[PDB]
Design a binder for this molecule. Structure first.
Ligand SMILES: Nc1ncnc2c1ncn2[C@@H]1O[C@H](COP(=O)(O)OP(=O)(O)NP(=O)(O)O)[C@@H](O)[C@H]1O
Ligand SMILES: Nc1ncnc2c1ncn2[C@@H]1O[C@H](COP(=O)(O)OP(=O)(O)NP(=O)(O)O)[C@@H](O)[C@H]1O
Ligand SMILES: Nc1ncnc2c1ncn2[C@@H]1O[C@H](COP(=O)(O)OP(=O)(O)NP(=O)(O)O)[C@@H](O)[C@H]1O
Ligand SMILES: Nc1ncnc2c1ncn2[C@@H]1O[C@H](COP(=O)(O)OP(=O)(O)NP(=O)(O)O)[C@@H](O)[C@H]1O
Ligand SMILES: [Mg+2]
Ligand SMILES: [Mg+2]
Ligand SMILES: [Mg+2]
Ligand SMILES: [Mg+2]
Lengths: 761, 332, 232
């Protein structure tokens, strides 16, 4: 089996599907099909055909024959590619045009920017010389290019007869009647689509199967005897993808789309907001199938505790009544968008309303890369821009932030060219304008000068850490496999033996021994999402979103199953219940303790969700967290031993320029009782010393050359500046253990007597 | 490399750029260019020229010749310096005036404070004695000084024909028709500019590249394939520079500027605040390129938790809708 | 006349140089590596495949010149310097609330390169009380936890260094010493015989001192005196 969630997105290869390719002819009403492809299509040489494009756009052209066109090719020209909205490499479908429909009229009008420089009737110069007796097929809404000399005027197919498409026979009596098709109309063409949304595939698949399927193929649901949900609610960080995704789905499904912007509704006088809502719903019902996208729904339907006026609760109630009135099932779907899912009134998040919710969260590396590719598809990038590096460096960047980053890169490119650009002149040199290209350094500078927005939001992603990055801890990994991986990859195994596992683990040990890394590594092994939460972050949550922060992170973990919810730095929240119970500063630790235990109680029934903790202070850890049904498994992470420290050094220096004479194993003997953090700080000090050394070396070399320029560039060239043993010796000189010999036997004692904390002392 | 952030502010020295200098003559419609500078400019002795000043202010004068004028000098008189808004040491540019445009009428009116003590028709005492057959170039909106005895009356070029600038030929039939050009009109002249803002260069450069470039040279952004940001938000300690900088940039970029003061919007009855906002945005769109400076925006768009009434959230929502409606990119 | 914007955070390059600071040669030498090199030469660390640390803590006797070192290192790198004191942070919560620490950190982000200095950690960084409780210290707990949260998100900004200073290292919260936070620990000692001469000279670098005054003579007699005492 496989994960069939992302199955609707898959394109089903068919004999009628041909890949896009360049044509041997620039004819706009004629393409060229390979003879074999035509035979599969039952077509013949020079036969009109309908090409199915993207965004519900299609054109009509006569297919020729040529053996150079490989089987998975169609050989269309640039104009057809633009009309279909398909770039090279897309997979269009081909259908026949048996009804050639020799048209009596083919209304043709020009575009203003393609007419600049025409001093004669366009009908007698462009249209008639190429259409009369040519029998060129024409598809309404497609821009065919024409030439009548030096100027090239492109006309849109305004109004054919038949209306859809026809063939331009000699009987087509028509001329150019005015210029009403100015180029600015392109703002509503090629606007949005599936290809314009990147970084979301699971959410996009969910939206498509909840919106497009009920509206295009309701027969499936009717036969299965299930009524599909009518309420969808997109939510996520501001600027992520919501309004784009809604419009993309609406345009791709080809259903009547009505946008109800919250500010627009609330900016009108009382009695017009409700009137507009009623009109929108009525029009959607009349023109079914339909979609009603309510952007910024939080403004028109905020939490009832926050809304003050009566003409706001009235609008909320009107919206609720209208949604309740949609149970007629007139192929109408109401989709929402709100960055504040909790700010929404609870009534909306109910059956018969917005009951199905999709979280358009922060994208991962591949998503950011795809977003950047989408946004830079039009910019004049140079041949040395590496978007992979930028995507790796852009952590916490939503799509809007990436678009702003591209814009800032372009601006920085302009600033570099400001020296050769004079602002006083009302016009800029054309050659200078066309020679501006965005380089990688511009992007790096823009990224340095740009800041992320969704850097505080919880991130649900598979960590990149593997077992290799962690040195030693073989037994800990061996037991973690049983505790986590087996009940996830093989859940039925436990049911086979009639015994359920435990969904809780606690890591206790000296600081810097690799407790945070183990959680990420085990998540990576099981390919399960990882949610990182720190005690300091939890403590500020109560002074803020309040009760709905811990509940929210746990709900997110539930929605993201399988998951590994890690609570680092339990030393603060899990502080043992004070004997003199009191205070509000610790009244937040008591909250993040009791409310957290309450959620732990309800989490054992979810399955495939494991709650892992980490504490450097097992003495103060609340004994309640150790209860069965909670973090009861206790795993001790010891200080690395002689063998483990070699692995730790190697991992810390797995990508370092270390010299050939450095004995990694030698340091292990001298560094005993040092945590992994100290072992990494040793390497950091060594790297800093090497940087100092090679900085001084390069400075001395350049100063030697400048102290008599006649001195030529000798064979001496900048070297690796590898980390010599001297640097490591100097680092070990200042290196100091972060765990004392008196603070290890105590950890051993707690390893012995930790779970006994639920009783007396 | 260098920090190219403060690059737009830099003035690009050009052969047409001359530094300001005192003139050997007090003539207001005549300056004096060094012969070599004229040769670089392809000008000749006694040729009308357009001088590009600051704050979108320029004058027209006939350039003479003199060897005492160093190459980086223009030798303009005090009146020309005042009209151009340029003090000594500024770097103006020089353009030719091939269309001398001998004008049929040169409307001239006086200023009240320069007329105190005149007991005769100003046309027969100041204008005609110095304009008839003098062929003095005149630029609309420039105050040229004249004398008809002891009193010195300075007149503004009210309405020339052609409207922009012309040469005062003998055929210029005109007299002083009233005194509608009282000196108090100077409150709206030489008001604000880049030189009137000090202590901010990085912020000023950012504002200029985010506002003036998209409005004057959108070709760069269009070719690069990037849509420039339309929303800018100045913030800082009260009284620092905000309202001054906004007006300075608006006047220097020479685009239709509309000021929407928050208190003024909120001081009106319900249904007039939103009406005024809509009118402002519509007028800005009509007269593109344009700028819509919303001072004290916090009053009309405060935090929703703090606002209590409905006719305030309505204004906030109207503003949000109007800004969302600006994606048409009409150079606004 | 009185100023108005005297309470607002100021983002400017300090005028203090290494000369105004007497002695501390080793401290300056290590601060160069810790701060200047990852700023002037950021690509150097990427060349060796190892990232630096954006945190430092100054602990030592009062009056030994911990505040001056931060300003001096900012001046050397020509980076903006933001000065924040624990007493100021404690009143922020009783006020702008959550959006004061977030705001100063955002300002530091916008002003990169920057050196965000937290003087007087003796108050905010008071060690988490065993009997956790109270709202007077519920502000120290806020300025501690909320500050650590911001420190966590600051390591990805680059060219922003967070420096602390504490005269009470005993009570300093152990969380601030974590990697990814103020983990580098630099000890500022009491000036020695040689350092005190430099301190006197700096304090009197623009003074009318007579021709018979032996600056070095005082150094011997003043032992154990902090720089503040030498200036007094
Ligand atoms: N996944 C994406 N792929 C491509 N472009 C994107 C993507 N996400 C965002 N963008 C771009 O960024 C813009 C901002 O996203 P938008 O769709 O307005 O977000 P939003 O969630 O509706 N914002 P708000 O209502 O202010 O919280 C889009 O209009 C695109 O130009
Ligand atoms: N076993 C290990 N192998 C390799 N590197 C390690 C190991 N243990 C610690 N380190 C390094 O030291 C850093 C700190 O350890 P970490 O994994 O964060 O432990 P922790 O228990 O979260 N520490 P703390 O929060 O300070 O109590 C890691 O991110 C690694 O860089
Ligand atoms: N940088 C500057 N250069 C010259 N004059 C200045 C400068 N900044 C302020 N001024 C003067 O001080 C006045 C007050 O500044 P103003 O532009 O009104 O500040 P503001 O930020 O708009 N005030 P508020 O809206 O009350 O917070 C200006 O009108 C000038 O007269
Ligand atoms: N090394 C030094 N060289 C010169 N002057 C010094 C030195 N150390 C201290 N001083 C002087 O003493 C003053 C106080 O020292 P400062 O640099 O503020 O230390 P601090 O650690 O901030 N003190 P405190 O906040 O009282 O614990 C300085 O501003 C100087 O005037
Ligand atoms: Mg939206
Ligand atoms: Mg931990
Ligand atoms: Mg103001
Ligand atoms: Mg201090």
């Amino acid at each position: 089996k496989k994960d069939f969630s992302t199955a609707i997105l898959e394109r089903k290869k068919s004999p009628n599907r041909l890949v896009v390719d360049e044509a041997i002819n620039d004819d706009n009403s004629v393409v060229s099909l390979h003879p074999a492809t035509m035979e599969k299509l039952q077509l013949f040489r020079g036969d009109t055909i309908l090409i199915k494009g993207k965004k519900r756009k299609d054109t009509v052209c006569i297919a020729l024959a040529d053996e150079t066109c490989e089987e998975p090719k169609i050989r269309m020209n640039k104009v057809v590619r633009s009309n279909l909205r398909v770039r090279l490499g897309d997979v269009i479908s081909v259908h026949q045009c048996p009804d050639v429909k020799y048209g009596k009229r083919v209304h043709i009008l020009p575009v203003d920017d393609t007419v600049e420089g025409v001093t004669g009737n366009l009908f007698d110069a462009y249209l008639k010389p190429y259409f009369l007796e040519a029998y060129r097929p024409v598809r309404k809404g497609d821009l065919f290019l024409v030439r009548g000399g030096m100027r090239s005027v492109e006309f849109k197919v305004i109004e054919t007869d038949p209306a859809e498409y026809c063939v331009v026979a000699p009987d087509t009596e028509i001329f150019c009647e005015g210029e009403p098709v100015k180029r600015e109309d392109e703002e509503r063409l090629d606007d949005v689509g599936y290809d314009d949304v990147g970084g979301v595939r699971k959410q996009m698949a969910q939206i498509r199967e909840l919106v497009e399927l009920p509206l295009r193929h309701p027969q499936l649901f009717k036969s299965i005897g299930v009524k599909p949900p009518k309420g969808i609610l997109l939510y996520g960080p501001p600027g992520s993808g919501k309004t784009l995704i809604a419009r993309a789905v609406a345009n791709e499904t080809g259903a009547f789309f009505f946008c109800i912007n919250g500010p627009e509704i609330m900016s009108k006088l009382a009695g017009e907001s409700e009137s507009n809502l009623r009109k929108a719903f009525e029009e959607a019902e009349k023109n079914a199938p339909s979609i009603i996208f309510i952007d910024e729904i939080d403004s028109i339907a905020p939490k009832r505790e926050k809304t003050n006026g009566e003409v706001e609760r009235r609008i909320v109630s009107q919206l609720l009544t209208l949604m309740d009135g949609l149970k007629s099932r007139a192929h109408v779907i109401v989709m929402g968008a709100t960055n504040r899912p909790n700010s929404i009134d609870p009534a909306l998040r109910r059956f018969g309303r917005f009951d199905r919710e999709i979280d358009i969260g922060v994208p991962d590396e591949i998503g950011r890369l795809e977003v950047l590719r989408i946004h830079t598809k039009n910019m004049k990038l140079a041949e040395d821009v590496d978007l992979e590096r930028i995507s790796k460096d852009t952590h916490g960047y939503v799509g809007a932030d990436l678009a702003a980053l591209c814009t800032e890169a372009a601006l920085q490119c302009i600033r570099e060219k400001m020296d050769v650009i004079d602002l006083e002149d009302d016009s800029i040199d054309a050659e200078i304008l066309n020679s501006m290209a965005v380089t990688n350094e511009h992007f790096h500078t823009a990224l340095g000068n740009s800041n992320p927005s969704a850097l505080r939001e919880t991130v649900v992603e598979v960590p990149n850490v593997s077992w290799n990055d962690i040195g030693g801890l073989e037994n800990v990994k061996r037991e973690l496999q049983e505790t986590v991986q087996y009940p996830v990859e093989h859940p039925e195994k436990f049911e086979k033996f009639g015994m359920s596992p435990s969904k809780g683990v606690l890591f206790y040990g000296p600081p810097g021994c690799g407790k945070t890394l183990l959680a990420k590594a085990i998540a990576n092994e099981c390919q399960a999402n990882f949610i990182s939460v720190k005690g300091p972050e939890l403590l500020t949550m109560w002074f803020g979103e309040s009760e709905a922060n811990v509940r929210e992170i746990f709900d997110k973990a539930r929605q993201s199953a399988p998951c590994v919810l890690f609570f680092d730095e339990l030393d603060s929240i899990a502080t043992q219940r004070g004997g003199g119970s009191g205070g509000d500063g610790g009244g937040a630790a008591d909250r993040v303790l009791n409310q957290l235990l309450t959620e732990m109680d309800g989490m054992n029934a979810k399955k495939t969700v494991f709650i892992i903790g980490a504490t450097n202070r097992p003495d103060i850890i609340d004994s309640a967290l150790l209860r069965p049904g909670r973090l009861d498994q206790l795993i001790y992470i010891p200080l690395p031993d002689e063998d483990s420290r070699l692995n730790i050094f190697k991992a810390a220096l797995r990508k370092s320029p270390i010299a050939k004479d450095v004995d990694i194993g030698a340091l292990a003997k001298y560094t005993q009782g040092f945590s992994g953090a100290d072992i990494t700080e040793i390497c950091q000090r060594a790297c800093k010393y090497a940087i100092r050394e090679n900085i001084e070396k390069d400075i001395e070399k350049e100063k030697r050359r400048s102290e008599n320029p006649e001195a030529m560039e000798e064979d001496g060239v900048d070297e690796v500046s590898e980390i010599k043993a001297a640097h490591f010796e100097e680092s070990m000189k200042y290196a100091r253990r972060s765990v004392s010999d008196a603070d290890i036997r105590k950890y051993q004692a707690f390893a012995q007597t930790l779970q006994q904390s639920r009783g007396f002392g």
